Amino acid sequence: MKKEVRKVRIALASPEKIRSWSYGEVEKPETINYRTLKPERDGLFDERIFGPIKDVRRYRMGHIELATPAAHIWFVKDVPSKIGTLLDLSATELEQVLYFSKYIVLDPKGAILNGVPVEKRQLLTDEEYRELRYGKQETYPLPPGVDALVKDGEEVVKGQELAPGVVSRLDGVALYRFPRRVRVEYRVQPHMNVVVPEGARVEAGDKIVAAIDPEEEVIAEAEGVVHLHEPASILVVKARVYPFEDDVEVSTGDRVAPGDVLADGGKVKSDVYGRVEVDLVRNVVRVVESYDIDARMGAEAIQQLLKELDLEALEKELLEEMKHPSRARRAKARKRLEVVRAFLDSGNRPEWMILEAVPVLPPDLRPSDLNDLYRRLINRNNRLKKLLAQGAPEIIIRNEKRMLQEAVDALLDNGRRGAPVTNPGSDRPLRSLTDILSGKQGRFRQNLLGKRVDYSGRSVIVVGPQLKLHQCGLPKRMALELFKPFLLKKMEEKGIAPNVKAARRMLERQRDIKDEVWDALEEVIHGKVVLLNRAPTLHRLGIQAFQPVLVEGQSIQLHPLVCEAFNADFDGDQMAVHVPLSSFAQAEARIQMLSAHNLLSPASGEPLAKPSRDIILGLYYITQVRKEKKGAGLEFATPEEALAAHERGEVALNAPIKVAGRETSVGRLKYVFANPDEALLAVAHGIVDLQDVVTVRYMGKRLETSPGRILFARIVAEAVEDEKVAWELIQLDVPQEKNSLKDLVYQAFLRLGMEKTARLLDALKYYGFTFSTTSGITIGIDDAVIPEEKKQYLEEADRKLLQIEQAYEMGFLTDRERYDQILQLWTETTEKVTQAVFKNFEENYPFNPLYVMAQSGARGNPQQIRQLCGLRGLMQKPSGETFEVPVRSSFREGLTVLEYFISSHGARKGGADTALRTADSGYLTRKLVDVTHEIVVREADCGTTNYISVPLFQPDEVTRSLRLRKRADIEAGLYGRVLAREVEVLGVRLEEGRYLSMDDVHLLIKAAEAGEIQEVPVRSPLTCQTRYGVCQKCYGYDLSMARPVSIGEAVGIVAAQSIGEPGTQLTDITQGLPRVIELFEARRPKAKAVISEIDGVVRIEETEEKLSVFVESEGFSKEYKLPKEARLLVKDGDYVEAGQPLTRGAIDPHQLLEAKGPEAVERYLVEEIQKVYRAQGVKLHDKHIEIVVRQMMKYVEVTDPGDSRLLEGQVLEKWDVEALNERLIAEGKTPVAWKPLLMGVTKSALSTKSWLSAASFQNTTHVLTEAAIAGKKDELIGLKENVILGRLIPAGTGSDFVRFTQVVDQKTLKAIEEAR
DNA sequence: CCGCCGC
RNA sequence: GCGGCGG
Ligand SMILES: [Mg+2]
Ligand SMILES: [Zn+2]
């Protein structure tokens, strides 16, 4: 029935749906009422609209029905106005003009021009809209007793002086009201009225003007004409004049258009649209330029526009505009077409971009900030409803819509336009909905950045020698609290307590609880495990799971071998501990997370459970053999009187129990041990020391090895029961060094299994330690022995220094030469003394404490040893130039005053370096994670076989000469890989797909030595077909384990980690972290080296303030300008492939991508990256640098369209889907030509397809804005995005591959058949 | 990087 | 957010 949430979708909200999720409508602004905490009704906190205040309430919504529309600030103020782009109004300036309603908008038709044709959609000032839209008859009053220079309705021109002090502003028709005077070529009082029109012809019998007094009223005479001159005032009308001779039309006030009849039948017709004024004072019909029109205001004006905009229409319109016009206008349309598409495409239409119904967030979600703003809206939205039914005066209506539109923006996003402040008290912007979603600590960034855990604890860690990697020492007292609930129950299970509350009080104040509470706890923890965490959590091993074994005190006992995993020593470091609550959590915790199960490092296939100093120390001292004094003749190799004599000479004081006597030193002649045990007992009785050379009969051979060695054999053969397989993997021919053991571990892992190895580790751990204590090794000032030759070599070098001095005091050597030669003097002299001290220990004190420590993988480093016994000699000055004088002393002897001071400089520079390099906070582990945090393993052997050939030989360093890449590096590229195609090499058939093990990579190397293979066909992430993910055959052998990678493993992570941790130690040409940042980030490095874009041969032109390297061949040469200060190493003559270093130093990815191609950029990056870690000791598998780098080119540009336009940057694979189904399923081969794009790691992240993820880093506004328009459906895949859901991650156990697995019992299975 | 201690 | 220490 109910279904797992697999897809999430963001779409626009229909006002109908707003009512849909809605429960009641908040109708009033009453926050809190004192009388009863009980909510005051129908404001915000009412319970019907949201729900019951007592014991699903904070899950319902209410809506406020806005009077006149307002809009979403999110869709209007985002950089690219989603509405401004779509509608085509000024994208950023025009909107604001009418969004609040101050300015006007236009509709169906205007035929008249203010000066230009009618504006289909534009807006004009109210004065001008009123002037011609509704017409504009404009008056011009006149001073009393003043005559005019224009008649009744005489045509007037704009700017003319109607009188001395008055002038007109418009052309059209100038109306005159009254004749205070009239001229008559052959004065009218208030009650007088002119019967005669404009300059009308007159006759004698014709009354002109009349009034009340029939007596003395204007009476015509002999041919008079009319010229009226004294108008009280003149009102000008924006109208045309149409004189008529006979009749007229409908009436004065009606509307007319061009053509419509005015008078005299169909003779005098109108020419413009306008109102009618049938004036008979001039016997003419003026049609004022005033026809109706329509237009609305503010959020309302766009609401209309949006509703009519027929996407389809503009879609087609843009289609034409797009591919036909020059790049200047086509580009604008293109960006405009996507939006249009998005809407139509997804369906959910754009008209909703307007707010008419503001959805109210639930009452329990917000217990204050947002409420103050909600009240504002409510108020104005309400004050407005009232201001509409009471009386609607315009100026107020608008002024109100404004404020309203402002408020609606507040609750959504404050600041975009001014900032709202709670009245006097704090000039602080009230946190609006947007502010609550973005920012460093917002809500989208909340689900990811982290938080504190229940069932946690932390304490100081202490070493627990006896403890096995399996377990961990945890303080009972801590466990008590940690496992409190689990304990309570078990308490009732056992009579200790009657109920839970009782068990609790029982632990509330009581001091011990003795054995019984303890018996219970220790019982509850039985097989459960907890996790442990170390300070900076760098790699997956930063947290391991252990079985807790309760202990006394405060500290937490940790296993020694895991001390390497978590960078953790015992000088006070503290670790945190957690508890897996779910039986599922517990499972994974102890299965795939326990310590003993994660032996190998995800970084390199090398072990991480490597025995450390102490263990090694012990193990070595016990396997070493001794050599003494050869008093004489060592020939028993043949004489029998040599067995007897040399054996009695031994009984004497002449021949030692360990003499250089080829076949056998008397030491072997004397003691011959049958059974293996036989040997050790003799030891235990004092006959033989462990380190003595004796003879011993083993399974099938008479072996000449010491007790110690043999004992070691047993220990291992005991750790793992298969005794034969034991000696098959150990070498008792040399003392056990950190490496001989390293390799033993690794071998054991591959050979006997995981857990069995764990057993051996503990084994070694135990013995190593014991033997360590009894061996009797300690340091004493005399233990640091100074070589007798030191006094020699220093003297030899000293005199030698005088020669160099006398040589300059003569003038032979330059000031510089002097210096360089002296350094050389010491640089060699010091190295001389180095091997000397060691030579003295090797020959005279084989068992020197200081020495033995160093040799054995235990502790100490050759370079250090030298600072004790030999001498630390060259310490550099402040800047960098090393000192001229060396530090002649050793630490054994008193390091002198100055020598110390001088040495100081270096120690300080090193400290500074460790600072800024440490605090970088695994910055790279951060960015790496950002671009690989979505990579996971879900598959079925991806079918696409496009492989990467791993090179077995390295080019030039000394010059052109093919070499065999170092053992290390070759491993790095081939270990745990899967062969793309089969390859017969030295007699063996290495099938296809086979995952080449270490041995198999040794083979290939040994073969390259002979000369049978130069490259290697192998599967890799760099060429995986699975869009989002990588499959089994492509990733490879590496796992925490050694067998092939299990599908469902968070490789993205794992790779990011393995690359980040190391970054902590990477502090002309420039490198280190910066080279790593420069490399992951496609950039133009300091020392750029001009790559050759054309592949031909080379030729130069010497000197001349500039040199020039020219790649020329068929007909053209790509000119390369190499500054007079550049270092070029390709010479006048031979060939140069595309993207080959023409200059010396670093290279620029972009260029190299263009010239050579992608398969080269990738391989460049990978290797150029490794280059730094390699030189820093770090050994990480190429796999990981690959996974990352691949993502750096998962996007490509478009040059030949089919669906979307060609200026886009979209996911590479998403195009392999389009092209595949455009040629395959649906015909019409519209090839989608693209261009591979090398985006930077950071930008790859930035623009990562899923919106959820974007909402996290960049800007939450833009991200959601765009994802809004195109109803985006976030296909839930990737750790980040799915983290927010709070759902099980798509990786790990969440792996779609196994998240669904069923367990049954043959009893219930046949039982389902019983149901059938 | 995480943990604490204090205006 | 400022200062001090620890890994
Ligand atoms: Mg430490
Ligand atoms: Zn693949």
Swiss-Prot record:
GO MF annotations in UniProt: DNA binding; DNA-directed RNA polymerase activity; magnesium ion binding; zinc ion binding
Gene Ontology annotations for the cellular component aspect, listed alphabetically: DNA-directed RNA polymerase complex
Keyword Endoplasmic reticulum attributed: no
Cofactor list: Mg(2+); Zn(2+)
E.C. number(s) listed in UniProt: 2.7.7.6
Domain of life (superkingdom): Bacteria
Pfam families membership: RNA_pol_Rpb1_1, RNA_pol_Rpb1_2, RNA_pol_Rpb1_3, RNA_pol_Rpb1_4, RNA_pol_Rpb1_5, RPOC_hybrid
Transmembrane segments: none
Binding note for cofactor: Binds 1 Mg(2+) ion per subunit. Binds 2 Zn(2+) ions per subunit.
Residues reported to bind Zn(2+) 2: C942, C1024, C1031, C1034
GO biological process: DNA-templated transcription
Residue numbers binding Mg(2+): D569, D571, D573
Keyword annotations from UniProtKB, A to Z: DNA-directed RNA polymerase, Magnesium, Metal-binding, Nucleotidyltransferase, Transcription, Transferase, Zinc
The reaction(s) this protein catalyses: RNA(n) + a ribonucleoside 5'-triphosphate = RNA(n+1) + diphosphate
Enzyme class per UniProt: transferase
Family: Belongs to the RNA polymerase beta' chain family.
Function: DNA-dependent RNA polymerase catalyzes the transcription of DNA into RNA using the four ribonucleoside triphosphates as substrates.
Subunit structure: The RNAP catalytic core consists of 2 alpha, 1 beta, 1 beta' and 1 omega subunit. When a sigma factor is associated with the core the holoenzyme is formed, which can initiate transcription.
Database matches in PANTHER family: DNA-DIRECTED RNA POLYMERASE, DNA-DIRECTED RNA POLYMERASE SUBUNIT BETA
The protein's name in its UniProt record: DNA-directed RNA polymerase subunit beta'
Organism this protein belongs to: Thermus thermophilus (strain ATCC 27634 / DSM 579 / HB8)
GN (gene name): rpoC
